[PDB]
């Protein structure tokens, strides 16, 4: 019993020393030559009304025009962000929904929550109604996130400490990703859809392999729960937002902790994070009714997006045209 | 909207908005309740009396032409600090305690203390149910003492304002006073506790109705500077 612990401690110390060997210089020293981008103003352009209760999640579309949002009253609404028209309105079986996703091909949507189920809806039918096509059961804890790989594969994050990979055609899991300690909160796919990251309440983030299904890397440095995780456009970095009013940037090849985005006048935790198209600007939502914009290369605050209640979700379009933010006051605002 | 197809799209959106208005009008006249408890507590049979790893349940009952929705949390693991934020807008919380064990009551007290002092549960009042009274009545006279579990039981006497075998009442009101001292340790007059002596009964719905009416009346009185 005491022999395995000693070996584990020795391995951890060796890994820490090895990582520290390649520390070299810092990012701030290198980047300080670049002049700052300056100050950014974004004006609200549209406001979307129609949700009864507070808004929990939203997702854009690849066509850069449509989006889907979920609400506590148990309603899914598909919007037309140009003319503010409503295309569909779907009622749910269970009203406690925590996440939603929109298919890359625009053929399906998914949602789930405290019912331990992920549901798939078919938007393209010969009849003029949207119906549910497949229910994915097998998880123990509540569902917290989900993302589409293609029309037949989806990855889910649950509160029972484990992730999973599903086959929608048959409805049975094909891989299970165990190894975390607490319940998992979010995940982020990669542009090539070969790897994905994940964050949990044990203040640790892991890197997974979809093909062969075991953990490849582990990152630490946060002090409290992990609420939202993003992933750099290049594919070799990712960003995290936690409950201790701090944001972190980690690299995959180097395996150290990069520059830190924090300010002494913020006490509340972060709810969502998202990057820009070129990765120059990182913007995150907070609990103090605001949404801050950070310079991703210099940890400088530049811009504020000032809602009535807590901001629960963000989103950036594929072509970088606009940013949409939801909140607990049931209003969606499209900024530019 | 300069094209005919855009006009048809706008008309479809307007019909969707009409349906949403109907849904809002239906939604604004309902009260949501959250039910919490333990395994030994009779919170499972309370639902049946009022009337596949699912993660949540739902029960509907009506009294005096008023709609009530009760949500029972199902297959979720030990700790609850994450999904408790979704219930910070319900009317009240129902708590069920099995007061017939003398051993796990400390765990129930700790759970009640954790729930009452939560940050996200401020301004929500709790309705406290004390279940399985006949078991307590059959167990007190056997003599299963309480002084060993609680050293302060020796210096306790039945309160004068109590309105009930005197020792059965002594035990009942000792447990009730423990729960109420936990409740009164804080609160600042923003949420209250409504204890009850529930048995295997049929008037639980009426008690919930009265407690909810009192809570809403107090909230409205506080809003208008009348209290």
């Amino acid at each position, epitope marked *: 019993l005491d022999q395995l612990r000693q070996e584990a401690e020795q391995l951890k110390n060796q890994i820490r020393d090895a990582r520290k060997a390649c520390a070299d210089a810092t990012l701030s020293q290198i980047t300080n030559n670049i002049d700052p981008v300056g100050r950014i103003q974004m004006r609200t352009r549209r406001t979307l009304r129609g949700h009864l209760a507070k808004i929990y999640a939203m997702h854009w579309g690849t066509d850069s025009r449509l989006l889907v949002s979920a609400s506590q009253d148990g309603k899914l609404i598909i919007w*037309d962000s140009y003319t503010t028209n409503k295309v569909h309105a779907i009622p749910l079986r269970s009203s406690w929904v925590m996440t939603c996703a929109y298919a890359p091909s625009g053929n399906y949507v998914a949602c789930g929550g405290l019912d331990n189920i992920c549901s798939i809806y078919n938007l393209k039918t010969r009849e003029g*109604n949207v119906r549910v096509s497949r229910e994915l059961a097998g998880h123990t804890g509540y569902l917290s996130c989900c993302r589409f790989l293609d029309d037949n594969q989806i990855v889910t994050s649950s509160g029972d400490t484990t992730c999973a990979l599903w086959d929608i055609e048959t409805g049975q899991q094909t891989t299970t990703f165990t190894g975390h300690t607490g319940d998992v909160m979010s995940l982020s796919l990669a542009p090539d859809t070969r790897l994905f990251v994940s964050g949990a309440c044990d203040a640790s983030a892991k890197l997974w392999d979809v093909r062969e299904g075991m953990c490849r890397q582990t990152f630490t440095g946060h002090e409290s729960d992990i609420n939202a995780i993003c992933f750099f456009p290049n594919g070799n970095a990712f960003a995290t937002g936690s409950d201790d009013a701090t944001c972190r940037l980690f690299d995959l090849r180097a395996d150290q902790e990069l520059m830190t985005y924090s300010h002494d006048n913020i006490i509340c935790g972060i709810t969502s994070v998202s990057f820009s198209k070129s990765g120059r600007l990182l913007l995150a939502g907070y609990d103090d009714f605001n949404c801050n914009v950070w310079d991703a290369l210099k940890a400088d605050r530049a811009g504020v997006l000032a809602h009535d209640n807590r901001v629960s979700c963000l989103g950036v379009t594929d072509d970088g045209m606009a940013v949409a933010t939801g909140s607990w006051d049931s209003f969606l605002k499209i900024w530019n | 909207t*300069l*094209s*005919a*197809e855009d006009k048809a799209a706008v*008309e479809r959106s307007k019909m969707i908005e009409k349906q949403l208005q109907k849904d809002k009008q239906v939604y604004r006249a309902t009260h949501r309740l959250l039910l919490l408890g333990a395994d030994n507590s009779g919170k499972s049979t309370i639902v049946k009396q009022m009337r596949k790893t699912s993660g949540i349940f739902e029960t509907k009952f009506q009294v005096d032409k008023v709609n009530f929705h009760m949500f029972d949390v199902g297959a979720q693991r030990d700790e609850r600090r994450k999904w408790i934020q979704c219930f910070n807008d319900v009317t009240a919380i129902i708590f069920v305690v099995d007061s017939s064990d003398y051993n796990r009551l400390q765990e129930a007290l700790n759970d009640f203390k954790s729930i009452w002092n939560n940050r996200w549960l401020r301004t929500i009042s709790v309705i406290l149910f004390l279940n399985k009274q006949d078991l307590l009545a059959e167990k007190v006279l056997a003599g299963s003492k309480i002084e060993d579990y609680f050293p302060e039981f020796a210096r306790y006497t039945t309160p004068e304002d109590a309105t009930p075998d005197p020792r059965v009442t002594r035990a009942k009101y000792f447990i009730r006073d423990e729960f109420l001292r936990i409740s009164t340790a804080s609160g600042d007059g923003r949420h209250y506790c409504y204890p009850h002596f529930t048995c295997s009964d049929t008037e639980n719905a009426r008690r919930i109705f009265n407690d909810c009416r009192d809570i809403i009346q107090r909230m409205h009185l506080r809003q208008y500077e009348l209290l």
Partner: single-chain antibody
Amino acid sequence: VQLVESGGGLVQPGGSRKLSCSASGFAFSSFGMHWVRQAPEKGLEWVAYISSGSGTIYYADTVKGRFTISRDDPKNTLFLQMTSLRSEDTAMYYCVRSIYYYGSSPFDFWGQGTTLTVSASADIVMTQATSSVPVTPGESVSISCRSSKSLLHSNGNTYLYWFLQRPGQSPQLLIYRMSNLASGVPDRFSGSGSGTAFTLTISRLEAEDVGVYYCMQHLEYPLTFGAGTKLEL
């Protein structure tokens, strides 16, 4: 998904007759409805239109005071009321679905139709340059259409449709908005144009492509069809 029309017959001049279209198999309460007429030896023609919520109704300038449309959502039935039948209303009538939102495909399903025999300006005109062409089973084919006004809109859409009914069957839909392919049609058809001149191309050819091809506009009411272009093999 199927629609059945009932009624028809022989009517003395000046009489009245009521037509019924019965829909069963889809969410009928969410589709607009049209009536389209085909003369015994001429092209197609539009008659009336009623929206999903009955909040908008349009009529043809040819017939405005004598015809009446009505829908009954609980029974899933569509009605047409005709009074004082002239000598021109001696054709076959069709029942057509239509749904309008961002990205939909209107005019997708057509009914079977019923026959009716009667004893004895500011709109856009669409002209088909050729009335018949000879083709070969395996070569490339091209059909052209002409318009009197630019169909391109400010938003960016060009409202042109191709139907290509077969000799003995109801019309179907090939291309909507001049570029987008239909659902169940083979992917060997294509469409292109510039706003006033349009063309339809077929790469291969098979024995099922024989029929008449039509050209319709949807920029503003009334809806004006073409003349037709028969292909003989």
